[PDB]
DNA sequence: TGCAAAAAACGCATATTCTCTATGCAAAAAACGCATTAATACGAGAATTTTGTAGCTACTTATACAAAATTCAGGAAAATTTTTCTGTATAATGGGAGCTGTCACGGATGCA
């Protein structure tokens, strides 16, 4: 799933998530600009492919 | 249902008399004295005699040297267990395991 998730001044960000009943977590979001990266058992990577 | 009143009983006249209060008799206890005998205790004699005191004597022990006949503490072997070291030869070629929902604060850096 998938937090909405918002900010410092208003102005909201969209981003996502996945874990199963066991295992890692995929976990999305979005820097201000339909972008995306991808994180999972890594928490170091803005990394989007 | 008021008594006046009669006869027999129930009350003022003595015999009887009979429990009754009253002294001399008498018989055996008792206790006192004549007293007698025996026994409880004083007198003398010399006999046992135990206790109290001295010296001799036998037992008991105070003490001075020490290796008795026995105990023990190390010392140095084994005896067996155990410990540390060294060695055994086909190929084998990048590691899993949670962190991902806390709130707020204080610097300390990075990033244009």
């Known amino acids: 799933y998938y937090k909405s998730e918002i900010d410092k001044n208003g102005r909201r960000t969209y981003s ?3 874990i199963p009943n066991r295992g890692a977590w995929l976990k999305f979001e979005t820097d201000r600009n339909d972008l995306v990266w991808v ?3 890594k928490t ?3 990394s989007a492919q």
């Open 39 to 41: 994180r999972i058992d």
């Open 44 to 46: 170091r990577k803005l």
């Open 16 to 18: 996502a998530s996945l």
